Amino acid sequence: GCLPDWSSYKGHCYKVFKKVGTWEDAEKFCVENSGHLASIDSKEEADFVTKLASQTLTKFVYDAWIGLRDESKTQQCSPQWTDGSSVVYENVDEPTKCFGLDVHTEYRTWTDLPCGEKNPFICKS
């Protein structure tokens, strides 16, 4: 349907890339292909991208970037403390605001991850 190196489904075209890249870069590339990092809506399209990812990244040692992130202005996303204090200052050793298919569950689960961790990704057009 789409490009040979891709796979069509429900008026959308996906493809898993073995080459790594930050969540940022991964998207800058998906866009360069007239699209974005894969986005899941249905549970159907979910297990699909799971297989699609499972079939391609046969080795299971890497997480695959998807198009979900935390817009939060802050390091972590909790806006208030337990004491009612507003979360102004922070010191999270390494905030994780970019999600990707969890490889430790066979790509069926989503896991937030450090944006900047070079993982393979999935594009959708």
Next chain:
Amino acid sequence: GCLPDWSSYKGHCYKVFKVEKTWADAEKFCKELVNGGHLMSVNSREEGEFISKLALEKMRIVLVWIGLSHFWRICPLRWTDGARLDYRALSDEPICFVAESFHNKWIQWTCNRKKSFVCKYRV
């Protein structure tokens, strides 16, 4: 400054507990312990270094629960293609935070796992 066994620092009082409790229980413990007491909150770099020295020095503790946590259906999660996240393929379990008394970094950690903590109340 404060009352016995609690250390004083800028209008506040902190006490480190080695008892090792869960996050939700440690917080509950700080509340039913002192009127207006809570699980320690860090609003500055100097306050965090005060706690670490307190926890590391007088008790040699490396990890302590901090009053910071949340669930994912609370964050502003958005996609890049435009869709609106309704299909939550993300664990509903909450994220919790521990502080390490060495460098003062905050680390996400499973909530239902016992960890020594620090309580905090205002005089």
Next chain:
Amino acid sequence: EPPLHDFYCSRLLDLVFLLDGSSRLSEAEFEVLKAFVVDMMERLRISQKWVRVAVVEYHDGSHAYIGLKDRKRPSELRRIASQVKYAGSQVASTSEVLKYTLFQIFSKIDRPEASRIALLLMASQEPQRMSRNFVRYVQGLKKKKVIVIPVGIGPHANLKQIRLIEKQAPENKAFVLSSVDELEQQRDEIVSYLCDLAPEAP
């Protein structure tokens, strides 16, 4: 050989001591670590019918000094532990050692009655490259019912890996000590927990 100290865990247990061999520990600190292994062993009914013991010093690879099937005198084992040579390597791959523990130490559960525990005494952080299969090994253990007790020592422990372990199961209770000196202190709280995970000879 009779019980040295009052703390005398006497239940079915297969405990594996894995000792960080990196230079994140001075030579003297390693001795304090080795001293810890001996103290523990002085609180276990180390028999082939009660508590079997294994000691491994890992670095680039893993070197076993004692195996669970080593039918020697309980005093002879502690002597071996006390004489464990100091590596001081640059890297101490926890992955390499847990792989060893999973594919060699507990390659076959021939003691189904006893509990399997891996006391992972770690004081450093392996380079992100050797951690490729880390989780897969930790998971493998969870399947073999090999409890893994991550013990963090000093300021260089992994913590990320420690947390990962403590996340697989609740039994993998973690201990994050300020230094090796904290080994003497929390030694008993550890043996009690370790013991309470083992069955009981009927």
